[PDB]
Amino acid sequence: QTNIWEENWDDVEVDDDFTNELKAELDRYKRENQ
Amino acid sequence: LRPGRIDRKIEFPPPSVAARAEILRIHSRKMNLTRGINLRKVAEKMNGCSGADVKGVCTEAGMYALRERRIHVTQEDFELAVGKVMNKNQET
Amino acid sequence: TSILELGQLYVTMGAKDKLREFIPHSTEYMMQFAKSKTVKVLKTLIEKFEQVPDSLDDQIFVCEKSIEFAKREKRVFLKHSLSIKLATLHYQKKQYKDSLALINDLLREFKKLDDKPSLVDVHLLESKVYHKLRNLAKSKASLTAARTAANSIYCPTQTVAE
Amino acid sequence: NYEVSEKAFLLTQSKVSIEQRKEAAEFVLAKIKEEEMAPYYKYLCEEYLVNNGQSDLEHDEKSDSLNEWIKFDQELYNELCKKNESKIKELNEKIQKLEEDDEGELEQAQAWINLGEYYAQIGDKDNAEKTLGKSLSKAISTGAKIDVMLTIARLGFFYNDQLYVKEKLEAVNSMIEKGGDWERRNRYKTYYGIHCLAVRNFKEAAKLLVDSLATFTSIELTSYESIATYASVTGLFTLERTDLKSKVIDSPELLSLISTTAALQSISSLTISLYASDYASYFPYLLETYANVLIPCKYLNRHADFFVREMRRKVYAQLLESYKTLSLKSMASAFGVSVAFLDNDLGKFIPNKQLNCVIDRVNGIVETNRPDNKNAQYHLLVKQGDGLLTKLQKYGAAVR
């Protein structure tokens, strides 16, 4: 996997930010629903 | 001057812009500066100035630049410092 | 002397806009008399357009005129004072871009390429510029460079107050 | 090189907009006309290749490519080869005359540097180095060594490369510690604040990157907003309330560029908006920052989620430190978001443990934890010696 990344924790995971933004819409949109 | 007291009788000139410009380029060298600086012009500004008075310019250009919030120093400060040291060269 | 008043009456008319474009000629027409007359009066007129308040344009527009109509004549001379106002216009316009770039010219101009007394003034403005920029040491710098070199000169009691 | 490498990056990142694609190679498509960029623009057209970088007159032309601007012509090369050879031939005998006349020391190295810088324009990662070496071979000035910095910086950062350059950056700055007197430390810390910004900087040169400005920038290796942007965000996303609200609270630096680029609008902007201790406002501001900041810029994208959830987490520290007793409901519910989903990644901070947060799903309530005598102080103690003890075991592991 490449050479030198920022390394650990580990790569953790991904597909969150947008998933969040999706909900950052939705949550807020839900809060807009609110 | 009778030799054995001073054997080799030697006289130190000139100096001039060039001496100072170098002396300037020496003193301004130490201080962090701003590129595009022409020291000859600065020393061309220099008249009736000397190698220790050259320090004055670099101090004043530094005085300027440190007052410019600059550990660098532009060229203008020096030529400004010249006249300002040319002040004290001519003043008192 | 009318175009002073009548100018403000021109302004009162908006014939300021007449007189705007006449100021290029009032330049010439005071240049028809004298330059020191002109430079004194020319500014004053547009200054009087600043009073009886003007859009920044007719100021800038006609300021920019006499600034260049300095240049067009022979004049490099205190079109920067005009430009001080223009930068001040820019400062009123809050274009510190326009101010400072001009100011820095105004500086380099007033840096003994032009008047050290006006150099104090532009600092003060530039300070304000900086201060409106909230560039504070800068505002300070200029202001001190104003105020310190203000001790070198005399400044308008206004400026002193300022 | 700069825009090159970025408009490389930009389109090589093209995801959001065809313009992310478009705008990038747009210039490049002209910039390859500007400079004979092919030899890397060659591989640069293999760079974003096998995604949308798949449309080229030389490498690959594919429909799944949304970028056709990753196209060539051999004219580019002929032009290039001409340009190159022209450039080459020019300096050739010139440098050879610099050799012939024994002409200049750096002046010899001069047309070398010229020889080299072509490769920057060219996108040749080769002779320029050797040229630089043979420039540096002719280098009697740390200013020519400065040019090594430039060169190596133009080397790596033409690809936004990594270590050797950084290593060189060390090596080149290692020689004389001067740092271009006041400056090249800038370039050092600048590029260093980019080097280490691969992908990290995180605490490290983020400060440094924040620190000196604008005392250089490079053109071909960087703009000034660049560092400002970059310096901010990491140092921002990393450094302290205090620090930030000491520094990015604002700087005349900032005050200058604030919204000047809109190329921010967010970074500490929406973060001090966060640092205003918002809940919801900042919750978009993130991705609002993100896609406006992170995806946009080389490391800013490449690191990705390092940022994402920490400030997400972070505020909760505030939110905690406010409340011993906080209802997560009052948080997650009364903050008008997904309770659970918020809570989930928030719960994903339980194992990341940076929560002192003592938190409910059911009653939806948050509590704290505290260092006390444990701290890490009387806490960490265990391991620290242990590792030593290991090394001490290692110590005795020598014997003979």
UniProtKB/Swiss-Prot annotation, chain A:
Coiled coil: none annotated. GO terms for molecular function: molecular adaptor activity; protein folding chaperone. GO terms for biological process: double-strand break repair via homologous recombination; filamentous growth; maintenance of DNA trinucleotide repeats; mRNA export from nucleus; positive regulation of transcription by RNA polymerase II; proteasome assembly; proteasome-mediated ubiquitin-dependent protein catabolic process; regulation of cell cycle. Keywords: Acetylation, Phosphoprotein, Proteasome, Transcription. Disruption phenotype: Impairs mRNA export and transcription elongation, and induces strong transcription-associated hyperrecombination phenotypes. GO terms for cellular component: cytosol; proteasome complex; proteasome regulatory particle, lid subcomplex; proteasome storage granule; transcription export complex 2. Present with 5590 molecules/cell in log phase SD medium. Versatile protein that might stabilize multiple protein complexes involved in diverse pathways. Subunit of the 26S proteasome which plays a role in ubiquitin-dependent proteolysis. Also associates with the TREX-2 complex that is required for transcription-coupled mRNA export, and the COP9 signalosome, which is involved in deneddylation. Part of the 26S proteasome. Associates with the nuclear pore complex (NPC)-associated TREX-2 complex and the COP9 signalosome. Interacts with CSN12 and THP3. The gene is SEM1.
Swiss-Prot record, chain B:
The 26S proteasome is involved in the ATP-dependent degradation of ubiquitinated proteins. The regulatory (or ATPase) complex confers ATP dependency and substrate specificity to the 26S complex. Keywords: Acetylation, ATP-binding, Cytoplasm, Nucleotide-binding, Nucleus, Proteasome. It is found in: Cytoplasm; Nucleus. This is 26S proteasome regulatory subunit 8 homolog. GO terms for molecular function: ATP binding; ATP hydrolysis activity; proteasome-activating activity; protein domain specific binding; ubiquitin protein ligase binding. Belongs to the AAA ATPase family. N-acetylated by NAT1. GO terms for cellular component: nucleus; proteasome complex; proteasome regulatory particle, base subcomplex; proteasome storage granule. GO terms for biological process: chromatin remodeling; nonfunctional rRNA decay; nucleotide-excision repair; positive regulation of RNA polymerase II transcription preinitiation complex assembly; positive regulation of transcription elongation by RNA polymerase II; proteasome regulatory particle assembly; proteasome-mediated ubiquitin-dependent protein catabolic process. Its main location: cytoplasm. Present with 4700 molecules/cell in log phase SD medium. May form a homodimer or a heterodimer with a related family member. Interacts with OLA1, TMA17, and UBR1.
Curated annotation (Swiss-Prot), chain C:
Changing F77L: In rpn6-2; temperature-sensitive mutant that shows defects in proteasome assembly when incubated at 37 degrees Celsius. It comes from the Eukaryota. N-acetylated by NAT1. Component of the lid subcomplex of the 26S proteasome, a multiprotein complex involved in the ATP-dependent degradation of ubiquitinated proteins. In the complex, RPN6 is required for proteasome assembly. Component of the lid subcomplex of the 19S proteasome regulatory particle complex (also named PA700 complex). The 26S proteasome consists of a 20S proteasome core and two 19S regulatory subunits. Belongs to the proteasome subunit S9 family. Present with 16800 molecules/cell in log phase SD medium. This is 26S proteasome regulatory subunit RPN6. It comes from Saccharomyces cerevisiae (strain ATCC 204508 / S288c) (Baker's yeast).
From Swiss-Prot, chain D:
InterPro entries: PCI_dom, Rpn7/CSN1, Rpn7_N, RPN7_PSMD6_C, TPR-like_helical_dom_sf, TPR_rpt, WH_DNA-bd_sf. The lineage of its organism: Eukaryota, Fungi, Dikarya, Ascomycota, Saccharomycotina. The keyword DNA-binding does not apply. The 26S proteasome is composed of a core protease, known as the 20S proteasome, capped at one or both ends by the 19S regulatory complex (RC). The RC is composed of at least 18 different subunits in two subcomplexes, the base and the lid, which form the portions proximal and distal to the 20S proteolytic core, respectively. Component of the lid subcomplex of the 19S RC. It holds the Pfam family RPN7_PSMD6_C. One of its GO terms (biological process) is proteasome-mediated ubiquitin-dependent protein catabolic process. Component of the 19S cap proteasome complex which acts as a regulatory subunit of the 26S proteasome, involved in the ATP-dependent degradation of ubiquitinated proteins. This is 26S proteasome regulatory subunit RPN7. TPR repeats lie at residues 109-142. SUPFAM superfamilies: TPR-like, Winged helix' DNA-binding domain. Residues 201-373 form the PCI domain. Present with 51900 molecules/cell in log phase SD medium. PROSITE patterns: PCI (PS50250), TPR (PS50005), TPR_REGION (PS50293). Keywords: Nucleus, Phosphoprotein, Proteasome, TPR repeat. GO terms for molecular function: structural molecule activity. The modification Phosphoserine is found at S55. It is found in: Nucleus. GO terms for cellular component: nucleus; proteasome complex; proteasome regulatory particle; proteasome regulatory particle, lid subcomplex.
